[PDB]
Chain A
Amino acid sequence: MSLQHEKVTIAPLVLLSALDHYERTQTKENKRCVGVILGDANSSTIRVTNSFALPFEEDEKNSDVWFLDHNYIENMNEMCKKINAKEKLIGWYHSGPKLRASDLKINELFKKYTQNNPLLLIVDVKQQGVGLPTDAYVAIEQVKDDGTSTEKTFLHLPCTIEAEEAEEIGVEHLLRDVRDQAAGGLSIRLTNQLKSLKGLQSKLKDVVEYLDKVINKELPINHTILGKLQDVFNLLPNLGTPDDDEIDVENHDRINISNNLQKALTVKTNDELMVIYISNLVRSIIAFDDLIENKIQNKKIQEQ
């Protein structure tokens, strides 16, 4: 297979075309649809260039009973190679909004079809998460904590958007909103700072409830999540160390640069005030000159 597949670059086409597949088959209300994702691979950066529906069927009696059509897959590959020689099999999207354990079995089909570990792409089309509209997952095999076997699992990777050139042009054009975040003026970033804080708290909350549930409601102890928290606590700045004390001194120094900068604009303003009080002075002269001139024109009619 392939080992390098670490970051997943995602065209803006992909999120919109998966969205369209869901609603143009009238699969809704958690009837899932499976389509392929084509693109390039065999390398760290994974580009999903194009996406298309496949035929799929699902059962609600046992959930590990399904139909996937292989014959359509064969025909798709033939057709699209000619369109672009940049579309080859790189995995499959799963339409979401959630990861199933049934997607573990469906994955073994796509692992056979293409010699790379196949990307599972969750396209959240129901958008109940404020972040992550795309999640990227590559199924891998690893030996699993608490004395347990080599188990099949899905490991999350970066699910980034960076966009293609092609894509950028339609994206900005359709856009006519001031964007969720753009980070332009000071107004946008003052909003952003406060948004970030709500952001930090929301992730952290779910973690509180995980630790509670290990010791009260017996979900199995996964030492990777406990270990990450150790690392979090060792990169936590401690007050009264030399590192923290420095932060305080630097705040005085940056605020000295700001103090001066605010005063250097009073100078700019002060130039304007004088230019307007000069302008007003000229309008005065103009006004008097006309009042004199009406007499000269009154006199000219009597004169002649």
Chain B
Amino acid sequence: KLEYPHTDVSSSLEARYFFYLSKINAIQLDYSTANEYIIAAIRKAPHNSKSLGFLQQSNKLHCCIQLLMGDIPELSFFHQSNMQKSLLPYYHLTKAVKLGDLKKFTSTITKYKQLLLKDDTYQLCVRLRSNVIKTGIRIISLTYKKISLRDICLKLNLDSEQTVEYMVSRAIRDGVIEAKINHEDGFIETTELLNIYDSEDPQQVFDERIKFANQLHDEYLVSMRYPEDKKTQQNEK
């Protein structure tokens, strides 16, 4: 209904809103729109021992939203955290998805089930089961351009030729892997072939950045004068 204000709002207050926006859009199966908000939330908020709670929960939600895309957080995130001994089931989520192993995942959300369920993040960890396969098939698209259907079934431990073919097609409906199946010759072909500076798209990519720089140009001019009316009216020697 778009009625949130922005006039009297605060560092905490806007950080809080965004966190609600994250949580709604992720569980509604759109992780691009969810991730937009969570990044904003950490950003507004101060960084203190009194903000610790807010930051702590923001980090927890962030990892999973990102994992759901099939894109992975870096190891330095967790390592240099002072908040790392509560992000330990979350670190294992990162490793397990990436390495594509079905059985590690199984163990992780069973071992750390109370932890995940306390914090309410256990429901998004269920859809991260799917991402184990999806992330493993992705690595394979990067590493191999032409690969038999057979070799793929051994790598992720799947039964039939048929099984891999159902999984891959769905995964490239989303566009995560970036391939096309050739069951006319029995191999999968990787379709990423770049040539993006030879497309017409780059003008369009710059136009959004230019538009953000115009946004700061306005925000600077209007902000600056607002204390200054009062200040010239204020008594002085």
Contact = CB atoms under 8 A, between A and B. Distances in A.
Contact of A272 (B210, B224, B237): B224
Contact of A259 (B198, B206, B234, B235): B206
A277 B231 CA distance: 11
A276 B224 contact: yes
Task: Report whether over half of chain A's contact residues are helix, strand or loop; otherwise say mixed.
Answer: helix
B227 interface: yes
A258 B210 contact: yes
Interface stretch (A37-45, A72-80, A174-182, A280-288): A280-288
A202 to B, nearest CB: 31
A75 to B, nearest CB: 69
B223 A265 contact: no
Contacts of A293: 237
Interface string A252-264: 1001101100110
Nearest to A264: B213
A283 B236 CA distance: 7
A283 B202 CA distance: 48
Interface residues of A, number: 28
Contacts of A280: 227-228, 231
Contacts of B220: 266, 269-270, 272-273
- Counting chain B residues whose Cβ lies within 8 A of the other chain, the interface size class is 20 to 34
B237 A286 contact: yes
A209 interface: no
Contacts of A146: none
B11 interface: no
A252 B235 contact: no
Contacts of B237: 286, 289-290, 293
Contact of A283 (B203, B206, B231): B231
A256 to B, nearest CB: 6
Given A262-B214, A284-B231, 16 more contacts: A249-B197, A255-B202, A259-B209, A259-B210, A262-B213, A269-B217, A272-B224, A276-B224, A276-B228, A277-B227, A280-B228, A283-B232, A283-B234, A287-B236, A289-B237, A290-B235
